[PDB]
């Protein structure tokens, strides 16, 4: 593993400064001490297929522009692209180009490290198993990721045990999990874009994050995942179109189904403005997640709006705000009045305002307005708790549906 | 199926739930799921004596000063890869201790501490030919000689070991020293190659450090070869335990002859091996994902006759998010607990290889809401190479709401999930205390009982040695002895009414009161409690035991019976007279 | 009259049966009958660390010494005639003692 | 039909209304209130602190616990001393309970959200300790584990 002082240096003055020219430099690389190594359009470290290609080991390196192939496969040995060691402080990783079968960015408890603009592939012949992680995080603080493509890399961007994170404008392709992100407290993510994955987010064991403005397109079996995920401010979330587990002659009965939100143990939230659409479930809701505040989403095109489960009652309609609820069936007789009807949830009545999207028609009928009247006031099915007293007859989050 | 064992109708299974952190083994019947019987086995129990009575603490050894314990993994002995009902054996690793129950008296009759190790977590027996060795796992590294010297736990003597007890003897038969820490372990159908689950590969105390390597590994150890070696003699020992301790510690990237290190991500906590004997399946508690070890490729790897460790994967399903245990139907399927999902996931494992291989196969058959948080599942007779997959329990860790509250501490939940059919579905939700973190379940034909004691038994022989010694046939004798302080009365007991209701002793004297239940029909049990004096047994019938207490209260003292002998139980009674100093 | 509680639904009646020789409390759930906690009174407990914990033993006093317990009838307090959920008084036949039982904690 | 062990000898009912608990623990509640004067006795507030004190032969080991890390994870102590483990939740998520289990000591304690539980045990054996969780509490129970370093004597 030689280091950078190998190669052509071509100084600039400063001394926090190395250059380096176009060419096909083959092997692997160390950094060894604080440089700013900035290369020219297009030179090609070819690593030929034993990992490691850079290990940076000194505090304040800038590497710009570098573009990385095929530099390893072994994961038992964590190789890597870019494998920032804890000791590099104030890393910059900006604007370089990665492909290649394993991890393209590790921080591995580096505080204050920046990996910035940088476009990641995965070949697609190594198993979605044995891809290798991309922008991967361990123990790290204070760092901030912004604005890096990452494509075919299993579990897209991956937290563990870090705090002083800031997540902005990643855009998430081809991936098994979005954000894969464990036990990480005080955290952010903002503006992330996650499409055709495995789960678009998933936000796992964790506090006091913020998760505001990020967005989920057609993923698969998941778009939101929060297990005990307490002191959050999530908002602005859009979740689209999360497919479930349909590939081949195969049905997977009673399971499966794809959830915009799967809310589990979380207590404490200030869920508030998301757009959750054309999914197969939403807002599913298990464990115990009393305290939590929801209010002003939105809900179209699901097959089924709600699964809540607990034997406690619970209302999302924090100061008169419900949730847009397209299911909601009528009544808005005050200009204003949000609804008179709270929108008490019945999965039956989901399928068909879906299948069929005539049927609110045929359910504005004063006869069957009647007959509803009468099944709101002499319970008929047993009330799955969730009730908004107060749902949204407008639809909130015009602003973020296409951006 | 039938979810409803009414009056009349008798369970199908017995269940053995631990007991969890309270010491405990709790028989259920299934699918009827309520408390047939309460073994204590770690805990010092009031109902049956055990802790206090002196065979208890006799079989206890130096473990009777500790209050507690922490049993997880039950698992009952195998003959031809075939439970035979004959022992049962747990683990304790609040203490590090291994306890055999026998279980045609459902009372446990060894316990031994194993030495020079701490937090006997994994806990499995040998399937092939015969429950011969026991293995256990001590999940926390510690420095050897645990002197207080060196605390340091990256040194080259900090380290832990796959023990390996004596089934039949109840002595350790041999310890290998391994890097890293062990979760869980197994065992295959061969009776060559068990296998444990090496998390802390990472080697780091501090908190996050555990997660810090990709991939962590799952041991395998080479029976035969640990076997020829303990014969062969080249094992070292450590303190004052004679126990054959071996060497599987990597040597400068050389593999020992005894271990292979088969890299496994992420963290795993489970390992299974498949009910045909074929692979062992390994989860991944912070991978989306379970390896999968074809078992007949192992003789390869130890031979050398193979290449890279990982060769041996020949799957790797992609489950969901937090694997955790694996359950096996014998139809060809497997049942793994998606922990951070909340699910229980089916999947076939042929298909899950033919995937792994490239074709497309969706492998994932269905996904069933637990509710919540599940650990470890069983389904019934999985461990046996005749699983019927006919039920499964998951023992769920969080109760949340799906119960009455009881307060701020809650009870786990375990659910009966009918497997029978292709479609799995609930049947059940059970409360239960103290944490049960795994179970096992046999036929009703299988698990054969013993309704009175036989006079012969090993459980109380000392008792029995200690009549002998004193001259006293314990069958038809009555009778108070004194030597120095020591005053032991040996009486029989029938309902209603003690054989000796009465004896003078000094005070401080060390009382020693056996008593003998001659009783010859069934459920007859007998108790014999001394107010005050913190002395409580039951006495079954044809059971004999003793209890040591010192008399230290001068003046008048009442004994009654507290199981229910007959309908004058509140007249069986005595008084056990201490005259002062 | 129906019998079944099903997987998600509640009991209607809480049963506190006592422990007999056990020493404990236990609370079931009627109709289903089923062990929805093991209240630790008079026993050496191994989960909740009753009588090993400062508190407990502080509780218990100079009782602490005897690991057994003989617990026959629970009674929970009223007021007027009726229960309030307040206290449950459970006795010891083994030791001589009676003890108390918030019923919130 | 039940089966039932060890006799229960009576039993007692109360419909679900007539029975309120509480989800979590308060910090008023009188049940430790004696665990929390001993605080006073040292001005220390469990609610935040992670101290170790040390008086002659008595060492006391205040902490907080929320899943999955005790707030302090190594306490150096000589041998022979009485240790009290004075352990507190600063978890208010109902459910997430706690244990503190120190390996072949005979200590174990629960802990549930917002209580107090302190354990006098002696440290015998000098050497190295881990102690546990036991109560599952979280995804990451495998490191809610701490090292306690006896000084040999």
Not at chain 1, 7 to 25: F, H, K, M, S, V
Not at chain 1, 223 to 240: E, Q
Not at chain 1, 325 to 351: F, H, K, M, Q, T
Not at chain 2, 36 to 51: C, E, H, K, Q, Y
Request: net charge negative; with cysteine; charged share 25%.
């Amino acid at each position: 593993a030689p280091q950078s002082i190998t190669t052509l240096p071509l100084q600039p003055d400063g001394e926090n400064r190395w250059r380096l020219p176009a060419g096909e430099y083959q092997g692997q690389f160390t950094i060894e001490q604080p440089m700013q190594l900035r290369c020219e359009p297009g030179a090609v470290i070819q690593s030929q297929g034993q990992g490691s290609s850079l290990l940076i080991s000194a505090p304040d390196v800038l590497v710009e522009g570098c573009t990385l192939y095929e530099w390893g496969s072994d994961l038992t040995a964590m190789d890597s692209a870019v494998f920032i060691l804890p000791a590099a402080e104030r890393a910059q990783i900006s604007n370089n180009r990665m492909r290649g079968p394993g991890f393209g960015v590790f921080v591995d408890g580096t505080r204050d490290v920046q990996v910035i603009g940088n476009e990641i592939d995965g070949d697609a012949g190594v198993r979605s198993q044995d891809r290798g992680n991309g922008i991967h995080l361990f123990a790290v603080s204070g760092a901030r990721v912004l604005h890096n493509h990452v494509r075919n890399a299993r579990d897209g961007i991956y937290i563990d045990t870090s705090n002083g994170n800031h997540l902005e404008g990643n855009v998430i392709e081809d991936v098994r999990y979005g954000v894969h992100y464990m036990f990480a407290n005080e955290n952010s993510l903002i503006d992330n874009v996650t499409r055709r994955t495995r789960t678009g987010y998933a936000l796992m064991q964790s506090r006091k994050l913020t998760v505001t403005g990020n967005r989920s397109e057609q993923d698969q079996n998941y778009g939101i995942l929060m297990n005990y995920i307490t002191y959050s401010t999530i908002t602005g979330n859009f979740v689209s179109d999360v497919q479930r587990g349909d590939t081949g002659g195969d049905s997977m009965i009673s399971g499966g189904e794809g959830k915009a939100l799967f809310i589990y143990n979380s207590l404490f939230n200030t869920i508030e403005n998301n757009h959750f659409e054309k999914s197969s479930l939403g807002i599913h809701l298990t464990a115990g997640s009393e305290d939590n505040r929801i209010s002003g989403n939105a809900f179209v095109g699901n097959q089924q709006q709600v699964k809540y489960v607990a034997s406690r009652t619970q209302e999302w309609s924090v100061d008169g705000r419900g949730n847009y609820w397209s299911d909601y069936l009528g009544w808005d007789r005050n200009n204003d009045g949000l609804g008179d009807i709270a929108y008490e949830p019945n999965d039956n009545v989901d399928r068909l305002l879906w299948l069929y999207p005539q049927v609110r028609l045929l359910m504005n009928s004063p006869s069957i307005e009647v007959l509803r009247w009468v099944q709101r006031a002499f319970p008929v099915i047993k009330s799955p708790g969730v009730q908004d007293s107060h749902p949204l007859m407008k639809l909130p989050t015009e602003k973020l549906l296409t951006e | 199926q039938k979810i409803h064992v009414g009056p009349g109708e008798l369970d199908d299974y017995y269940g053995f739930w631990s007991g969890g952190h309270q010491g405990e083994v709790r028989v259920l019947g299934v699918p009827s799921m309520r408390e047939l019987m309460r073994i204590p086995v770690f805990n010092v129990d009031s109902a049956t004596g055990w802790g206090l009575t002196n065979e208890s603490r006799h079989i206890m050894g130096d473990s009777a000063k500790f209050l507690n314990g922490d049993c997880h993994h039950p698992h009952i002995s195998m003959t031809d890869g075939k439970y035979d009902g004959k022992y049962l054996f747990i683990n304790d690793k609040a203490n590090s201790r291994v306890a055999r129950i026998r279980l045609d008296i459902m009372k446990c009759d060894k316990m031994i501490t194993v030495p020079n190790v701490q937090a006997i977590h994994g806990l499995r027996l040998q399937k092939v030919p015969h429950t011969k060795y026991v293995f256990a796992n001590a999940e926390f590294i510690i420095p050897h000689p645990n002197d207080g010297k060196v605390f340091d736990l990256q040194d080259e003597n900090s380290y832990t070991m796959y023990n390996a007890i004596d089934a039949e003897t109840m002595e350790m038969a041999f310890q290998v020293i391994v890097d890293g820490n062990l979760d869980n372990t197994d065992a295959d159908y061969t009776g060559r190659f068990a296998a444990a689950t090496c998390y802390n590969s990472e080697k780091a105390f501090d908190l996050g450090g555990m997660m810090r390597n990709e991939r962590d590994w799952v041991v395998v150890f080479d029976i035969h070869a640990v076997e020829a070696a303990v014969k062969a003699g080249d094992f070292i020992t450590l303190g004052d335990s004679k126990t054959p301790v071996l060497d599987g510690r990597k040597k400068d990237g050389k593999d020992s002859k005894f271990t292979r290190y088969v890299p496994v991500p992420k963290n795993p906590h489970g390992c299974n091996t498949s009910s045909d004997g074929k692979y062992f399946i390994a989860a991944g508690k912070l991978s989306p994902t379970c390896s999968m070890i074809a078992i007949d490729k192992l003789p390869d790897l130890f031979a050398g006759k193979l290449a890279d460790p990982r060769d041996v994967i020949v799957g790797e399903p992609e489950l969901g998010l937090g694997p955790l245990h694996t359950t096996f139907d014998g139809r060809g399927n497997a049942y793994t607990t998606l922990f951070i999902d909340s699910q229980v996931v089916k999947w076939n494992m042929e298909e899950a290889v033919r995937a792994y291989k490239g074709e497309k196969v969706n492998y994932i058959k269905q996904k069933l809401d637990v509710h919540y948080q599940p650990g470890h599942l069983h389904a019934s007779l999985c461990e046996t190479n005749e699983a019927d997959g006919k039920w499964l329990v998951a023992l769920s860790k969080f109760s949340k709401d799906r119960f009455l509250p009881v307060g701020p501490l809650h009870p786990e939940n375990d659910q009966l999930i009918d497997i029978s059919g292709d479609e799995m579905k609930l049947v059940h939700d059970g409360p239960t205390f103290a944490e049960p973190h795994d179970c096992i379940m046999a036929r009703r034909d299988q698990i054969k009982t013993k309704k009175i004691w036989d006079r012969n038994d090993p459980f109380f022989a000392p008792t029995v040695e200690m009549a002998k010694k004193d001259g006293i046939n314990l069958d038809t004798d009555n009778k108070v002895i004194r030597d120095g302080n020591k005053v032991r009365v040996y009486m029989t007991s029938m309902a209603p009414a003690f054989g000796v209701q009465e004896f003078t002793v000094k005070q401080g004297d060390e009382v020693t009161v056996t008593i003998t239940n001659i009783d010859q029909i069934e459920d007859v049990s007998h108790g014999f409690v001394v107010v005050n004096h913190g002395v409580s047994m039951e006495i079954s019938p044809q059971q004999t035991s003793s209890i040591t207490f010192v008399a230290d209260k001068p003046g008048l003292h009442w004994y009654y019976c507290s199981w229910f002998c007959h309908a004058l139980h509140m007249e069986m009674v005595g008084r056990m007279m201490v005259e002062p100093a």
